Amino acid sequence: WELRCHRLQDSLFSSDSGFSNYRGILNWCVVMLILSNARLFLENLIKYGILVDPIQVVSLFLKDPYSWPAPCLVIAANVFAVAAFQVEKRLAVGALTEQAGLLLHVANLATILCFPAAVVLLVESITPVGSLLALMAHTILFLKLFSYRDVNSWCRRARAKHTVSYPDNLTYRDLYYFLFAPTLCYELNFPRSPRIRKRFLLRRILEMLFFTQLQVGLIQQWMVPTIQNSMKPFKDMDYSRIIERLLKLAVPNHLIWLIFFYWLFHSCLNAVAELMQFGDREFYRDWWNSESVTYFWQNWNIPVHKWCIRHFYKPMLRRGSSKWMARTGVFLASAFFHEYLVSVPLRMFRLWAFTGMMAQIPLAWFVGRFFQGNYGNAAVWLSLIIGQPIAVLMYVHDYYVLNY
Amino acid sequence: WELRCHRLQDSLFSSDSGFSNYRGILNWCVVMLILSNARLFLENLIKYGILVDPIQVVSLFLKDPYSWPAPCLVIAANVFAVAAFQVEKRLAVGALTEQAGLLLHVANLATILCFPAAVVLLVESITPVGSLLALMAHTILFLKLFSYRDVNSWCRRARAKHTVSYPDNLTYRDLYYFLFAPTLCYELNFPRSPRIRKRFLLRRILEMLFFTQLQVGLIQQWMVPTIQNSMKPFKDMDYSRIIERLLKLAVPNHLIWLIFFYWLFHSCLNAVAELMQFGDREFYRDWWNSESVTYFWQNWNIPVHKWCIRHFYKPMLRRGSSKWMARTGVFLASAFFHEYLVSVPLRMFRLWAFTGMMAQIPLAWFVGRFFQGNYGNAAVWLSLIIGQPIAVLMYVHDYYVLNY
Ligand SMILES: CCCCCCCC/C=C\CCCCCCCC(=O)SCCNC(=O)CCNC(=O)[C@H](O)C(C)(C)COP(=O)(O)OP(=O)(O)OC[C@H]1O[C@@H](n2cnc3c(N)ncnc32)[C@H](O)[C@@H]1OP(=O)(O)O
Ligand SMILES: CCCCCCCC/C=C\CCCCCCCC(=O)SCCNC(=O)CCNC(=O)[C@H](O)C(C)(C)COP(=O)(O)OP(=O)(O)OC[C@H]1O[C@@H](n2cnc3c(N)ncnc32)[C@H](O)[C@@H]1OP(=O)(O)O
Numbered sequence A, B: 001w002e003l004r005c006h007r008l009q010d011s012l013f014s015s016d017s018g019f020s021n022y023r024g025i026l027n028w029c030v031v032m033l034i035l036s037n038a039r040l041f042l043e044n045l046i047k048y049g050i051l052v053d054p055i056q057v058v059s060l061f062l063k064d065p066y067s068w069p070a071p072c073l074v075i076a077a078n079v080f081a082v083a084a085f086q087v088e089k090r091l092a093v094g095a096l097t098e099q100a101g102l103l104l105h106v107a108n109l110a111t112i113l114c115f116p117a118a119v120v121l122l123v124e125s126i127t128p129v130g131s132l133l134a135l136m137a138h139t140i141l142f143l144k145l146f147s148y149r150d151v152n153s154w155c156r157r158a159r160a161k162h163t164v165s166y167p168d169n170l171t172y173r174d175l176y177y178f179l180f181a182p183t184l185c186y187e188l189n190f191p192r193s194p195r196i197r198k199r200f201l202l203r204r205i206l207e208m209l210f211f212t213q214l215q216v217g218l219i220q221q222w223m224v225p226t227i228q229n230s231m232k233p234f235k236d237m238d239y240s241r242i243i244e245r246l247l248k249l250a251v252p253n254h255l256i257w258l259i260f261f262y263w264l265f266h267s268c269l270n271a272v273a274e275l276m277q278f279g280d281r282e283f284y285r286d287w288w289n290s291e292s293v294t295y296f297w298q299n300w301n302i303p304v305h306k307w308c309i310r311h312f313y314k315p316m317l318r319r320g321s322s323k324w325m326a327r328t329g330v331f332l333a334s335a336f337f338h339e340y341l342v343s344v345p346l347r348m349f350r351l352w353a354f355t356g357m358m359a360q361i362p363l364a365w366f367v368g369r370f371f372q373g374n375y376g377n378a379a380v381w382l383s384l385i386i387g388q389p390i391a392v393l394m395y396v397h398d399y400y401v402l403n404y
Helices: A023-049 A054-063 A069-092 A098-122 A130-159 A172-180 A198-227 A239-276 A293-299 A302-318 A323-346 A352-370 A374-385 A388-403 B023-049 B054-063 B069-092 B098-122 B130-159 B172-180 B198-227 B239-276 B293-299 B302-318 B323-346 B352-370 B374-385 B388-403
Strands: none
Touching: A023 A198, A023 B023, A023 B239, A023 B374, A069 A098, A069 A130, A069 A172, A098 A130, A098 A323, A130 A172, A130 A302, A130 A323, A172 A239, A198 A239, A198 A388, A239 A374, A239 A388, A239 B023, A293 A302, A293 A352, A293 A374, A302 A323, A323 A352, A323 A388, A352 A374, A352 A388, A374 A388, A374 B023, B023 B198, B069 B098, B069 B130, B069 B172, B098 B130, B098 B323, B130 B172, B130 B302, B130 B323, B172 B239, B198 B239, B198 B388, B239 B374, B239 B388, B293 B302, B293 B352, B293 B374, B302 B323, B323 B352, B323 B388, B352 B374, B352 B388, B374 B388
């Protein structure tokens, strides 16, 4: 019975092991967060929720609507929605010329982009956090209407040669189901879930509330005191002081962005999809396992990646153009939308976001051409800390100092 | 081109996805620890390492050896090692009766267990942290010598009917290579690595030093102030106060035990195995992914599990006994060794460790019969926080209060 029991192996944590199953770490983080903050979350939940008076605020908005510009914009987006729908319904039956339809759709999209920006920059009575919601609603509406017109154009061009054909997909039910759906690519037959899971909805709502409380606590107890150490704007300040102050904020800002990602792309979108019985719930991929910046940029946001691939990248390639030109176009569009979403709601136009997005390129080349394995993943995790979140934190800090 | 792109799926974080690859979380923890504590680690490393004078302490021990009982015990363990080796070498050639050899081996093992305990309980000049090292060395020596005599007995009984046979494996080189090897199961041919990786050794030493500094910082900045809030012993204290105080210490104690596991079972053992070119490096398995307490107890420590299975469990089953009796025997041996390793170095004999190990049973039954999936893993992670680490923390706290 002298037989052997040892054999060449390697410990699980070592990179040469090829081990990947680490769900226990996630469950540990959840258990630690709950054990540490459950009493405070319950206290704050009772305190705030005992003041829940939605009828009060609804009536208040109903007494004077012209004093709340952000919900008025979120409501007026439906005018552009109905305009695009009417253009499409006339294009199907009505013999409206395709060039006229294209021109009207381009006008509708340009107005969708330009109207909220004008109303925000001109009306000084709108808060810089409802302005962001209005601008996000209008950006999402712009992308969704682009996809809508594109898919309907494809189906129309096809028609010249349990399931729904082309002309019977133009209804307000389908259009509005698409407008509220957690996706930016239009289809005629969406995949559906069998039923609404109430425990799933409850857990998602609890996650949303808990991470909201956690983010407010993080901000008000870690970043506001650190900012109030020396309240000066980042503009008109030596680079040494800028870096010295950003070193104290890089970590809590990173945690805030992580909580943003989780409670926005996992819990909120799954709650919406569960309420709507939406089938496809692939809203993200393993960006945390990225070994280069390009993998992270592709896999951190799947809706926008699908949109860029299906309506912006591949149509541009099919018309004849090098991949470099299409990548440059995507880069410029992303920079423009970063500006649209950051500078406009704050009315603060600096060169920080642009140079951040620019310096993101040689960093990507370096991480791709020098690091590999777990060191590439560490370099990506480090680039997330001193990358674009810093360029947004500078804006938010300068605004909080200049305006309070 | 109206074809579809959506399909029924589920987000990666949801338990219904079946996703497991989460190495990015580990790399994130490492990057965060480094970014947060690198300056302090470098400062403390410079400060302490500029005092490195090993020749000084070696000479000091050489001037008066009778004043340092712990290294004298760690040195005197070699006497028992050589005694067992001589018994075996005489059993091979020398016609020593097998019953006499068995009796001498039993006497040697009983002395291995009883001598350090007596020297510790009788000599009051030994520190309660060198006492633990001596007791651990003698426990490990006891287990290793048990395995040695068992394997040699198997090979001898077989003999009555690149590679090494039985009689040519009895040498001081092989015995001492086994004694320093990170394993408790003896073999005649160990698997070997091809070469010593210097970068691997450097990273393991750096991990050891870094986690040592981190643990000292955790203790001296989180648990010593919390203890000094009201310095009273856990004995002669109301249960309400006991639980109220343990609630403030459950978390840092858990983090301390996690760092213990990592820097002891991964970095230290891999450094030793790399210095010795040891092949098998499976020192642990995915205990963090456990869905019941039994899986965790089996997979958290692979050396002791292999020992219990190969020399204690299976030999007991082959002689005829129900599985319940063997499990009870393992439980009693583990309780005895917990006492031997905790109570003796502190000279403090209470009923806390025994009732902790006892209450571990109905907790295991409950977690097995009620929870499943990620909830079982959460229950196991919660049982690790209020389980045995608490029963060791009570001992250490009472000692630190009573003695300083
Ligand atoms: C917005 C809300 C945010 C909430 C909080 C989120 C937290 C996230 C969590 C944690 C990180 C912290 C936050 C870090 C980041 C913060 C950034 C902001 O917040 S800015 C704010 C404003 N928003 C933007 O400015 C848009 C940002 N970008 C995006 O949303 C997308 O990720 C985007 C637009 C970048 C996706 O675009 P693509 O990179 O997928 O596009 P293509 O270039 O077409 O990629 C396809 C790739 O495949 C290759 N390819 C080649 N042949 C192909 C083929 N046949 N088919 C497909 N691909 C092909 C192509 O060459 C390309 O790869 P090749 O770049 O060259 O390496
Ligand atoms: C020591 C240094 C620690 C440093 C820090 C570590 C940190 C760790 C990290 C994080 C957690 C925090 C710390 C929590 C824990 C702290 C506890 C202490 O520190 S106490 C201190 C003193 N030491 C002890 O008292 C020993 C503790 N125990 C151990 O070391 C082992 O894990 C031990 C002895 C429990 C392993 O024994 P088995 O459970 O493997 O033994 P069997 O019962 O034979 O298991 C085999 C199983 O397979 C089944 N089986 C059935 N047929 C089989 C067959 N044919 N072959 C094999 N198995 C079979 C058997 O029925 C059994 O499973 P069925 O229990 O019934 O569910």
